[PDB]
Design a protein around this ligand. Structure first.
Ligand code: CL
Length: 252
Protein backbone atom coordinates (compact mmCIF):
# COMPACT_ATOMS: atom_id res chain seq x y z
CA UNK A 1 0.00 0.00 0.00
CA UNK A 2 2.26 2.66 1.47
CA UNK A 3 4.31 5.16 -0.53
CA UNK A 4 7.03 7.64 0.53
CA UNK A 5 4.42 10.42 0.58
CA UNK A 6 2.51 8.51 3.32
CA UNK A 7 5.66 8.53 5.47
CA UNK A 8 6.43 11.50 7.70
CA UNK A 9 10.06 12.53 8.23
CA UNK A 10 12.93 10.09 7.56
CA UNK A 11 14.26 12.44 4.87
CA UNK A 12 17.81 11.13 5.11
CA UNK A 13 16.59 7.51 5.01
CA UNK A 14 14.37 8.33 2.00
CA UNK A 15 17.33 10.01 0.18
CA UNK A 16 19.57 7.04 0.79
CA UNK A 17 16.87 4.68 -0.55
CA UNK A 18 16.45 6.89 -3.64
CA UNK A 19 20.21 6.81 -4.27
CA UNK A 20 20.46 3.04 -3.81
CA UNK A 21 17.27 1.69 -5.35
CA UNK A 22 14.71 4.13 -6.71
CA UNK A 23 16.98 6.30 -8.90
CA UNK A 24 18.89 3.43 -10.45
CA UNK A 25 15.70 1.38 -10.99
CA UNK A 26 14.10 4.37 -12.80
CA UNK A 27 17.28 5.33 -14.71
CA UNK A 28 19.84 2.52 -14.95
CA UNK A 29 21.52 4.39 -17.78
CA UNK A 30 22.55 7.08 -15.15
CA UNK A 31 24.57 4.55 -13.17
CA UNK A 32 27.29 3.39 -15.55
CA UNK A 33 29.72 2.76 -12.66
CA UNK A 34 27.15 0.34 -11.15
CA UNK A 35 25.12 0.25 -7.98
CA UNK A 36 24.54 -1.99 -4.93
CA UNK A 37 21.85 -4.68 -4.98
CA UNK A 38 22.12 -5.38 -1.19
CA UNK A 39 20.60 -2.72 1.07
CA UNK A 40 20.78 -3.28 4.86
CA UNK A 41 18.25 -1.40 6.97
CA UNK A 42 19.43 -1.45 10.57
CA UNK A 43 18.47 0.04 13.87
CA UNK A 44 16.21 -0.33 16.92
CA UNK A 45 13.20 -2.65 16.51
CA UNK A 46 9.69 -1.31 15.95
CA UNK A 47 10.62 1.64 13.74
CA UNK A 48 9.09 0.86 10.36
CA UNK A 49 11.85 -1.04 8.52
CA UNK A 50 9.26 -3.32 6.89
CA UNK A 51 7.02 -0.45 5.86
CA UNK A 52 10.01 1.47 4.36
CA UNK A 53 10.88 -1.57 2.29
CA UNK A 54 7.23 -1.92 1.02
CA UNK A 55 7.14 1.76 0.27
CA UNK A 56 10.30 1.44 -1.88
CA UNK A 57 8.66 -1.39 -3.89
CA UNK A 58 5.69 0.90 -4.53
CA UNK A 59 7.93 3.79 -5.67
CA UNK A 60 9.59 1.57 -8.29
CA UNK A 61 6.51 -0.64 -9.08
CA UNK A 62 8.43 -3.67 -8.01
CA UNK A 63 7.45 -7.13 -7.10
CA UNK A 64 7.84 -7.46 -3.32
CA UNK A 65 8.77 -10.82 -1.83
CA UNK A 66 8.53 -10.72 2.00
CA UNK A 67 10.80 -13.33 3.65
CA UNK A 68 11.26 -13.95 7.35
CA UNK A 69 14.69 -15.36 8.09
CA UNK A 70 13.60 -17.12 11.32
CA UNK A 71 11.06 -19.13 9.36
CA UNK A 72 13.68 -20.13 6.77
CA UNK A 73 16.09 -21.18 9.56
CA UNK A 74 13.57 -23.60 11.12
CA UNK A 75 13.02 -25.75 7.98
CA UNK A 76 17.21 -29.49 3.90
CA UNK A 77 14.08 -27.54 2.93
CA UNK A 78 16.06 -24.36 3.70
CA UNK A 79 18.67 -24.26 0.92
CA UNK A 80 15.89 -25.17 -1.50
CA UNK A 81 13.74 -22.29 -0.14
CA UNK A 82 16.60 -19.75 -0.48
CA UNK A 83 17.20 -20.88 -4.08
CA UNK A 84 13.48 -20.70 -4.85
CA UNK A 85 13.13 -17.17 -3.43
CA UNK A 86 15.94 -15.79 -5.64
CA UNK A 87 14.75 -17.72 -8.70
CA UNK A 88 11.21 -16.52 -8.31
CA UNK A 89 12.60 -12.98 -8.04
CA UNK A 90 14.72 -13.44 -11.22
CA UNK A 91 12.03 -15.19 -13.29
CA UNK A 92 9.27 -12.68 -12.45
CA UNK A 93 11.59 -9.72 -12.95
CA UNK A 94 12.66 -10.87 -16.45
CA UNK A 95 9.21 -12.15 -17.49
CA UNK A 96 7.47 -8.83 -16.61
CA UNK A 97 10.13 -6.12 -17.24
CA UNK A 98 9.81 -4.95 -13.62
CA UNK A 99 12.22 -4.90 -10.64
CA UNK A 100 11.86 -7.40 -7.81
CA UNK A 101 12.69 -6.73 -4.15
CA UNK A 102 13.41 -9.57 -1.75
CA UNK A 103 12.83 -8.28 1.74
CA UNK A 104 14.49 -10.38 4.44
CA UNK A 105 13.25 -9.56 7.89
CA UNK A 106 15.60 -10.38 10.78
CA UNK A 107 18.38 -11.16 8.28
CA UNK A 108 20.88 -11.82 11.11
CA UNK A 109 18.89 -15.05 11.81
CA UNK A 110 20.66 -16.53 8.75
CA UNK A 111 23.83 -16.05 10.89
CA UNK A 112 26.45 -22.06 7.86
CA UNK A 113 24.82 -23.92 4.94
CA UNK A 114 21.95 -21.38 4.60
CA UNK A 115 24.38 -18.41 5.03
CA UNK A 116 26.58 -19.75 2.18
CA UNK A 117 23.69 -20.52 -0.19
CA UNK A 118 22.30 -17.04 0.53
CA UNK A 119 25.57 -15.21 -0.22
CA UNK A 120 26.03 -17.17 -3.45
CA UNK A 121 22.63 -15.93 -4.62
CA UNK A 122 23.60 -12.35 -3.63
CA UNK A 123 26.79 -12.66 -5.73
CA UNK A 124 24.63 -13.96 -8.60
CA UNK A 125 22.20 -11.02 -8.81
CA UNK A 126 25.23 -8.72 -8.67
CA UNK A 127 17.11 -6.05 -11.67
CA UNK A 128 16.76 -7.85 -8.26
CA UNK A 129 17.41 -6.19 -4.92
CA UNK A 130 17.74 -7.64 -1.48
CA UNK A 131 16.72 -5.43 1.42
CA UNK A 132 17.79 -7.01 4.71
CA UNK A 133 16.42 -5.72 8.01
CA UNK A 134 18.16 -6.21 11.34
CA UNK A 135 18.19 -4.74 14.77
CA UNK A 136 21.37 -6.71 15.57
CA UNK A 137 23.82 -5.59 12.83
CA UNK A 138 26.84 -6.66 14.99
CA UNK A 139 25.66 -10.24 14.43
CA UNK A 140 26.68 -9.97 10.73
CA UNK A 141 30.31 -10.82 9.97
CA UNK A 142 32.34 -8.65 7.55
CA UNK A 143 32.15 -11.16 4.63
CA UNK A 144 28.39 -11.15 4.96
CA UNK A 145 28.32 -7.33 5.10
CA UNK A 146 30.32 -7.07 1.86
CA UNK A 147 27.19 -8.08 -0.08
CA UNK A 148 25.38 -5.09 1.50
CA UNK A 149 27.14 -2.02 0.24
CA UNK A 150 24.35 0.30 1.25
CA UNK A 151 23.73 0.39 5.00
CA UNK A 152 21.01 2.68 6.28
CA UNK A 153 20.28 3.50 9.94
CA UNK A 154 16.52 3.70 10.63
CA UNK A 155 16.21 5.87 13.77
CA UNK A 156 13.69 6.23 16.60
CA UNK A 157 10.99 8.64 15.53
CA UNK A 158 11.55 12.36 16.03
CA UNK A 159 8.95 14.87 17.13
CA UNK A 160 7.14 15.22 13.81
CA UNK A 161 6.97 11.45 13.31
CA UNK A 162 5.69 10.82 16.88
CA UNK A 163 3.00 13.39 16.36
CA UNK A 164 1.86 11.76 13.07
CA UNK A 165 1.95 8.35 14.81
CA UNK A 166 -0.32 9.59 17.64
CA UNK A 167 -2.65 11.24 15.12
CA UNK A 168 -2.87 7.95 13.19
CA UNK A 169 -3.35 5.58 16.16
CA UNK A 170 -5.66 7.86 18.14
CA UNK A 171 -7.94 8.56 15.13
CA UNK A 172 -9.33 5.11 15.92
CA UNK A 173 -10.36 5.94 19.49
CA UNK A 174 -12.40 8.57 21.33
CA UNK A 175 -10.16 11.23 22.92
CA UNK A 176 -11.12 13.95 25.33
CA UNK A 177 -9.17 17.24 25.49
CA UNK A 178 -5.84 15.59 24.69
CA UNK A 179 -3.15 17.70 23.11
CA UNK A 180 -1.33 15.37 20.64
CA UNK A 181 1.65 17.74 20.41
CA UNK A 182 2.27 17.30 24.14
CA UNK A 183 1.99 13.50 23.89
CA UNK A 184 4.61 13.69 21.14
CA UNK A 185 6.88 15.92 23.35
CA UNK A 186 6.57 13.46 26.24
CA UNK A 187 7.55 10.47 24.16
CA UNK A 188 11.04 11.33 23.05
CA UNK A 189 12.90 8.02 22.98
CA UNK A 190 9.90 5.78 22.38
CA UNK A 191 9.74 3.73 19.16
CA UNK A 192 6.84 3.66 16.61
CA UNK A 193 5.62 0.39 18.03
CA UNK A 194 5.92 1.68 21.67
CA UNK A 195 3.60 4.50 20.55
CA UNK A 196 1.03 2.07 19.17
CA UNK A 197 1.30 0.16 22.48
CA UNK A 198 0.81 3.38 24.50
CA UNK A 199 -2.43 4.19 22.64
CA UNK A 200 -3.67 0.57 22.98
CA UNK A 201 -2.91 0.66 26.71
CA UNK A 202 -4.59 4.04 27.24
CA UNK A 203 -7.67 2.71 25.40
CA UNK A 204 -7.57 -0.46 27.47
CA UNK A 205 -7.83 1.68 30.65
CA UNK A 206 -11.18 3.15 29.56
CA UNK A 207 -12.50 -0.19 28.19
CA UNK A 208 -11.65 -1.97 31.43
CA UNK A 209 -13.45 0.82 33.41
CA UNK A 210 -16.47 0.51 31.11
CA UNK A 211 -16.78 -3.24 31.82
CA UNK A 212 -16.09 -2.88 35.56
CA UNK A 213 -18.80 -0.22 35.77
CA UNK A 214 -21.22 -2.09 33.44
CA UNK A 215 -21.53 0.90 31.06
CA UNK A 216 -22.08 0.48 27.29
CA UNK A 217 -19.38 2.73 25.88
CA UNK A 218 -16.01 3.73 27.28
CA UNK A 219 -15.41 7.28 28.46
CA UNK A 220 -13.13 9.59 26.45
CA UNK A 221 -9.41 8.92 26.94
CA UNK A 222 -7.79 11.87 28.85
CA UNK A 223 -4.26 13.19 29.35
CA UNK A 224 -4.42 11.54 32.79
CA UNK A 225 -4.81 8.14 31.07
CA UNK A 226 -1.79 8.71 28.87
CA UNK A 227 0.37 9.86 31.79
CA UNK A 228 -0.66 6.81 33.84
CA UNK A 229 0.39 4.59 30.92
CA UNK A 230 3.76 6.42 30.55
CA UNK A 231 4.54 5.88 34.30
CA UNK A 232 4.50 2.07 33.69
CA UNK A 233 5.51 1.76 30.00
CA UNK A 234 9.12 2.90 29.44
CA UNK A 235 10.97 3.14 26.06
CA UNK A 236 11.80 -0.42 24.95
CA UNK A 237 15.11 0.86 23.48
CA UNK A 238 17.50 2.24 26.14
CA UNK A 239 20.71 4.36 25.93
CA UNK A 240 22.96 1.28 25.89
CA UNK A 241 21.35 -0.21 22.80
CA UNK A 242 21.47 3.19 20.99
CA UNK A 243 25.19 3.63 21.63
CA UNK A 244 25.71 0.13 20.21
CA UNK A 245 24.14 1.37 16.93
CA UNK A 246 26.42 4.48 16.87
CA UNK A 247 29.50 2.32 17.59
CA UNK A 248 28.58 -0.16 14.85
CA UNK A 249 27.94 2.74 12.40
CA UNK A 250 31.25 4.54 12.99
CA UNK A 251 32.95 1.11 12.73
CA UNK A 252 31.02 0.31 9.50
CL1 CL B 1 11.65 -2.09 12.49
Amino acid sequence: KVSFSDIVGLDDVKEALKEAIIYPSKRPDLFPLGWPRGILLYGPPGNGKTMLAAAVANEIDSYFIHVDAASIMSKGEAEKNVAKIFNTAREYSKKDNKPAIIFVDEIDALLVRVRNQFLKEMDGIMMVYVIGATNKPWRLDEPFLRRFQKRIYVPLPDFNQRLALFKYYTSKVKLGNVDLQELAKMTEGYSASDIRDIVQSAHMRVVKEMFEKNLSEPREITMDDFKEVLKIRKPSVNQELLKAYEAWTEKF
